[PDB]
Design an enzyme around this catalytic site. Structure first.
Site, short mmCIF file in Angstrom:
data_model
loop_
_atom_site.label_atom_id
_atom_site.label_comp_id
_atom_site.label_asym_id
_atom_site.label_seq_id
_atom_site.Cartn_x
_atom_site.Cartn_y
_atom_site.Cartn_z
N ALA A 101 0.85 -1.01 -0.10
CA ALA A 101 -0.04 0.08 0.00
C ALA A 101 0.75 1.22 0.35
CB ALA A 101 -0.86 -0.24 1.12
N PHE A 134 3.15 3.89 -2.58
CA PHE A 134 2.91 4.80 -3.47
C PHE A 134 2.24 4.86 -4.96
CE2 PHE A 134 5.77 8.13 -1.27
CZ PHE A 134 4.76 9.36 -1.18
N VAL A 135 2.97 3.40 -5.38
CA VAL A 135 1.81 2.78 -6.24
C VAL A 135 1.22 2.41 -6.41
CG1 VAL A 135 2.63 1.30 -8.43
CG2 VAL A 135 4.40 2.29 -7.46
N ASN A 141 14.61 -7.52 -2.61
CA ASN A 141 13.52 -7.62 -3.56
C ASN A 141 12.69 -8.96 -3.63
OD1 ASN A 141 12.04 -4.93 -3.91
ND2 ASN A 141 14.04 -5.03 -4.79
N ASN A 168 6.99 -4.44 -8.74
CA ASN A 168 8.18 -4.84 -8.53
C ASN A 168 9.60 -5.02 -9.20
OD1 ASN A 168 7.13 -6.88 -5.18
ND2 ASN A 168 6.61 -5.16 -6.06
N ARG A 201 5.18 7.08 -21.22
CA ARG A 201 6.47 8.04 -21.92
C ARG A 201 7.00 8.84 -22.90
NH1 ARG A 201 9.15 6.08 -16.24
NH2 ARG A 201 8.14 6.85 -15.10
N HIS A 236 13.56 -1.47 -18.34
CA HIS A 236 13.22 -0.02 -18.52
C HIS A 236 14.81 -0.32 -18.71
CE1 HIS A 236 9.47 -0.20 -16.59
NE2 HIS A 236 9.74 -0.18 -15.81
N1 LIG Z 1 10.22 2.15 -13.28
C1 LIG Z 1 8.52 1.30 -13.09
O1 LIG Z 1 8.24 0.79 -14.16
C2 LIG Z 1 8.86 1.58 -11.52
C3 LIG Z 1 8.44 2.86 -11.10
C4 LIG Z 1 7.48 2.72 -10.02
C5 LIG Z 1 7.60 1.42 -8.61
N2 LIG Z 1 8.52 1.06 -9.32
C6 LIG Z 1 8.73 -0.41 -8.34
O2 LIG Z 1 7.20 -0.47 -7.42
C7 LIG Z 1 7.31 -1.28 -6.44
C8 LIG Z 1 6.32 -0.32 -4.70
O3 LIG Z 1 7.31 1.07 -5.50
P1 LIG Z 1 6.20 2.47 -4.11
O4 LIG Z 1 7.14 3.14 -5.00
O5 LIG Z 1 4.94 1.86 -4.14
O6 LIG Z 1 7.08 1.97 -2.93
P2 LIG Z 1 6.48 1.87 -1.29
O7 LIG Z 1 8.06 2.03 -0.65
O8 LIG Z 1 5.97 3.74 -1.60
O9 LIG Z 1 5.25 1.25 -1.24
C9 LIG Z 1 6.13 -0.80 -1.01
C10 LIG Z 1 5.35 -1.19 0.14
O10 LIG Z 1 5.10 -1.62 0.13
C11 LIG Z 1 4.73 -2.65 1.62
N3 LIG Z 1 5.46 -4.01 1.88
C12 LIG Z 1 7.30 -4.29 2.41
N4 LIG Z 1 6.64 -5.17 2.47
C13 LIG Z 1 6.29 -5.74 2.04
C14 LIG Z 1 5.65 -7.04 2.40
N5 LIG Z 1 6.69 -8.43 2.69
N6 LIG Z 1 4.19 -7.13 2.52
C15 LIG Z 1 3.58 -6.13 1.88
N7 LIG Z 1 3.90 -5.29 2.06
C16 LIG Z 1 5.15 -5.06 2.27
C17 LIG Z 1 5.41 -0.86 2.27
O11 LIG Z 1 5.58 -1.14 3.86
C18 LIG Z 1 5.43 -0.68 1.16
O12 LIG Z 1 4.14 0.78 1.75
C19 LIG Z 1 8.98 -1.19 -6.00
O13 LIG Z 1 9.47 -2.85 -6.56
C20 LIG Z 1 9.76 -0.18 -7.70
O14 LIG Z 1 11.12 -0.53 -7.53
C21 LIG Z 1 8.42 0.77 -10.51
#
Ligand SMILES: NC(=O)c1ccc[n+]([C@@H]2O[C@H](COP(=O)([O-])OP(=O)(O)OC[C@H]3O[C@@H](n4cnc5c(N)ncnc54)[C@H](O)[C@@H]3O)[C@@H](O)[C@H]2O)c1
Ligand SMILES: NC(=O)c1ccc[n+]([C@@H]2O[C@H](COP(=O)([O-])OP(=O)(O)OC[C@H]3O[C@@H](n4cnc5c(N)ncnc54)[C@H](O)[C@@H]3O)[C@@H](O)[C@H]2O)c1
Ligand SMILES: NC(=O)c1ccc[n+]([C@@H]2O[C@H](COP(=O)([O-])OP(=O)(O)OC[C@H]3O[C@@H](n4cnc5c(N)ncnc54)[C@H](O)[C@@H]3O)[C@@H](O)[C@H]2O)c1
Ligand SMILES: NC(=O)c1ccc[n+]([C@@H]2O[C@H](COP(=O)([O-])OP(=O)(O)OC[C@H]3O[C@@H](n4cnc5c(N)ncnc54)[C@H](O)[C@@H]3O)[C@@H](O)[C@H]2O)c1
Lengths: 300, 300, 296, 296
Positions: free
Chosen positions: C10, C12-13, C85, C109, C141, C165
């Site tokens: 839960a 940002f994404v 991860n 992820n 993009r 990416h």
């Molecule tokens: N380049 C892309 O396409 C792109 C863009 C954005 C994000 N991402 C990827 O998306 C993922 C999340 O990004 P984000 O910005 O939302 O991150 P974030 O840190 O805001 O959110 C991740 C959430 O995962 C939860 N979490 C951690 N371990 C957990 C577990 N074992 N079980 C359940 N929840 C757990 C955290 O508590 C956190 O709320 C990352 O792996 C990131 O690399 C990729």
């Protein structure tokens, strides 16, 4: 698999209902009619608009009930002296329901054919479906006209106007101004009694008002929108609170009859019939309406 | 103040266009016709559907051009041997444009009447409006049918299919399969040459296919959707790239003529006419089409 | 019974994906996380917006996997490098997959391709039902930069690309058009090359601006569109991380390729006629992806 | 020329308001903030989602007020207690108002009523064009709890209320209905009382869950709906912080009251027939609001 909606009768109301539904991308649509070419042409036309509007719904026309098999919802808009009217629509309704019902046993049937309450009763009897899954569209349309007139008079958004009513169309309608509000505020606070009375009158004659303007045809945009909203309520299980023709077993002192009443409409069709506490005047209107509806039922 | 859209001709295409537009809540709509009661009834009907769909748009019907005053966009859908057809539509178009144009000097005029290219030319001549603000709807509809057939054959979403074409309807159409793709990928990668040829053929005869099914009427759902998308492009200044009948001054070797070509459509109407590099075969099709269009123009 | 969508993570994404999804009224949403309170709070907040926007979907936050049972789609956006991860991904999938045997899993992820491969191995689900989101975002993009440069509507720009990416991305300007017309007709070679480069560095560009955060609006939108493709069986043609069994000459690996996405997940992997120049880029990219896999 | 919407403060509420607004394709959006990079990054991220969702609106981030010139609507969500927010509000309005003389200002900062009053004083704008968002959010929470309890669609629940947030809120269950039917017909007195209390504490409930953050999805949705009412002149009937000149017996003060909101801003202030019980609540609330004003 996508939801499946079958519309029996590809006339003005039927095809317009398909239009409102397709744009919502709720499920695949089957348009059926007895007249060759008409359903196929309207369906293909609507279907060719999909790339423009961006909806991925299959819209097919047919003359074969076999194509309506396993529909989630069946919409009946195939209806056409007063006794002759009933007989004519009864034959059409009976024919439509007996051929469609068996092919979609789990479907909810939404009747639009007039006389609405009677035809819905017949559809239930012919289908053998649980009463909660055979409903009629009437109240939502009348309430929409009422709400439109209020929003127009009060000078407010149509999105903030709500209204509940009962009975059928025209003289069979049971207006309930007391149960209409603008963002929770009684409409009586925005519109004087005399103007409100005029609006109720215009609502009762609302259907005829369109007829007198078109000369050779009845309303279809609003009736289809009303019908589509009910279909959406079932498919998305929204639990909408609206007036629909439902089978009564004692509510309001009425039994063994389909009548326009407030219900909660969801995936299971009529999930609950609300019993509002009506005052003396309101009950007088309901009794007069119930009488007329009963008479039509007896003729049937 | 809300945008104002006037639709001249409240028939099947005109009223259906109003329907697509109202649901988008783009601006107030005025439906005009010469026949009394019809526009008023269809407008009121559509208007009474507003509380159900949730759109706050005023939809009024009229027989007086005075009510179309200061419109941002004017849609003309009032059209009805071949020489007689031109004469008949020319009189109607001339009459519609001469009475509406003066009352909305800053408006963009979108013609739908057939023969499309000729009527658009006449509308520009009668209105005296800058050529960029008088366009005709044709290519978007043909391209929509083409895209629908492709999505259906390829088994992909209609939202991922794009296509560009030129010319007019039927024999005047200039199909350009080379300029059609599915998510950026040439359609020739999804559909064999022979099936693609069949699809192009079905597109050329697409309008007649609907006519042969309806027997007593032509298509309106797709034509209205196509017309509505162009209206939206102007009102929201979306800079859509689409095929529309525009006035040419040398492009493709054509001058002093309205012809279906790729353009960028925005608030200023035609903001740019794209000149695609056509191969030998494609130019052969364009020249044959240009000839027929020129002939119709000469007759006019 | 409405469709059910579970979002693991839960942040940002994940929360933003819930937002895009809720507005579309596609089904009930479950937001799960390991941090107590966070998912419950965000879910309730979004739920309270329902009367304003008019959507009827239950948005519930939880820390219990039992609540994600019988989901039609599972979105994984919980990642925090390959070790961290991988442990997180293994933990999430092992607990979720068993409770929703008929679900389609959409991985977000990073490293995307490797984590999707891992999720497939851990769940035991058919390969067509375990995919990763990456290409839709990069293409988005690219399409934005094209629309902006050409000065046309973003609705008329389409594009296909492959790989992952940044450096692992395989741009294909040749397979991008504006209303069916090649983008080369609107944008000159040098300018187009700069747009491709900005696309490769797109993610990093947002990070350099936000400073402490990463992109979420576009990534979430890309993920939601894929979820929609599945729930409505729209058969969208998009680049996604899919399991290859010979296509493009690649075996036993998850790689960004063009597919037809529907209710059955990857319903078809498209085989594009890549020239020698484009094939070299793909081979180099595939090599980098395989390296990550071997390390995994 | 499209409509122009400027949002001052690119934090959670501001950026989320940009999200709701962008999807509706109501006009171009400008996100402004004092922190460099943050607004540029969030705007670009949301902009890159445009090809996926299909909306054509420019979303630009800036630190320069000159970019907010000629806005049709200005949303202020930059507040950080009365001193801090007053200085911030005065700073934002003094620089923005002059550049957009015909704009409608929608305040979201807290303390809501006082800041709206301040913005009106600083801008010199007609009082009808300077309003605050507060009631739509509280009503939204109330409507959500009602729908949830009654088990009906959130689209069929309506409600009016007055005053400010929490203790300053003036609940009016009597003025809430489900498809025109009194809520009292669906929910018993004691249960209804608990829902009103949960409404009063609605904001605090989210904070207790999130721990470090405050609500933003619903607040942003409430703000966007008001922005829409103005841009399309929908004449919505909603509770907003408006300038009173005698209504309800109150003068020279901004207070949450029911109004018809359109392009001219507050086009009409509705005078509800409040009974003695409801009037006492309003008087107590008005007193607390006036206190804040005197301190201001
Ligand atoms: N380049 C892309 O396409 C792109 C863009 C954005 C994000 N991402 C990827 O998306 C993922 C999340 O990004 P984000 O910005 O939302 O991150 P974030 O840190 O805001 O959110 C991740 C959430 O995962 C939860 N979490 C951690 N371990 C957990 C577990 N074992 N079980 C359940 N929840 C757990 C955290 O508590 C956190 O709320 C990352 O792996 C990131 O690399 C990729
Ligand atoms: N107040 C309302 O909600 C409202 C408003 C308008 C019309 N209606 C009712 O809706 C029905 C249709 O109205 P319309 O205006 O669309 O009519 P219409 O005449 O345009 O269309 C009816 C269609 O039914 C078809 N039909 C007839 N018998 C059939 C059969 N046995 N099987 C399958 N199709 C058959 C016809 O061929 C025709 O295409 C009528 O019963 C009418 O009274 C209700
Ligand atoms: N390929 C396409 O894009 C396409 C598809 C269908 C129809 N069309 C064209 O659209 C036009 C309308 O088609 P339709 O099917 O809606 O027809 P229709 O007959 O249903 O409606 C035309 C309307 O125009 C009105 N009208 C006639 N003269 C008028 C005047 N002087 N002023 C104002 N109104 C007047 C009529 O009374 C009628 O209501 C025709 O020119 C037709 O060829 C184009
Ligand atoms: N109960 C409600 O109705 C409710 C709910 C949520 C938020 N709010 C209010 O909304 C406001 C913002 O809440 P948030 O959660 O988005 O906060 P936040 O801290 O995330 O964002 C505020 C943004 O304002 C910016 N800012 C500060 N000073 C500025 C200045 N002088 N000019 C331009 N930008 C400036 C910051 O840099 C920051 O990005 C607060 O005043 C808060 O009390 C009220």
């Amino acid at each position: 698999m996508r939801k499946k909606i079958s519309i029996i009768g590809a006339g003005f109301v039927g095809s317009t209902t398909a239009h409102w539904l397709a744009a919502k991308e709720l499920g695949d649509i089957v348009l059926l009619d007895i007249v060759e070419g008409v359903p196929q042409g309207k369906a293909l036309d609507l279907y060719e608009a999909s790339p423009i509007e961006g909806f991925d719904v299959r819209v097919t026309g047919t003359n074969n009930y076999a194509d309506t098999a396993n529909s989630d919802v069946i919409v009946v808009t195939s209806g056409a002296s007063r006794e002759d009217l009933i007989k004519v629509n009864a034959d059409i309704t009976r024919a439509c329901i007996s051929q469609a019902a068996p092919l979609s046993p789990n479907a909810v049937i939404i009747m639009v054919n007039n006389p609405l309450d009677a035809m819905t009763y017949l559809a239930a009897e012919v289908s053998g479906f649980p009463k909660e899954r055979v409903i009629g569209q009437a109240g939502v349309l009348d309430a929409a006209r009422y709400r439109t007139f209020i929003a127009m008079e009060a000078g407010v958004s149509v999105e903030d106007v709500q209204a509940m009513l009962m009975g059928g169309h025209g003289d069979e309608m049971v207006p309930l101004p007391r149960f209409s509000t603008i963002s929770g505020i009684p409409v009586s606070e925005f519109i004087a009694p005399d103007r409100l009375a005029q609006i109720v009158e215009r609502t009762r004659k609302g259907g005829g008002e369109i007829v007198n303007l078109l000369k050779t045809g009845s309303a279809y945009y609003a009736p289809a929108a009303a019908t589509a909203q009910m279909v959406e309520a079932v498919l998305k299980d929204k639990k909408r609170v609206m007036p629909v023709a439902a089978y009564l077993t004692g509510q309001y002192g009425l039994n063994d009859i389909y009548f326009g009443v407030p219900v909660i409409l969801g995936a299971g069709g009529v999930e609950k019939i609300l019993e509002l506490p009506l005052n003396e005047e309101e009950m007088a209107l309901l009794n007069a309406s119930a009488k007329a509806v009963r008479a039509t039922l007896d003729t049937l």
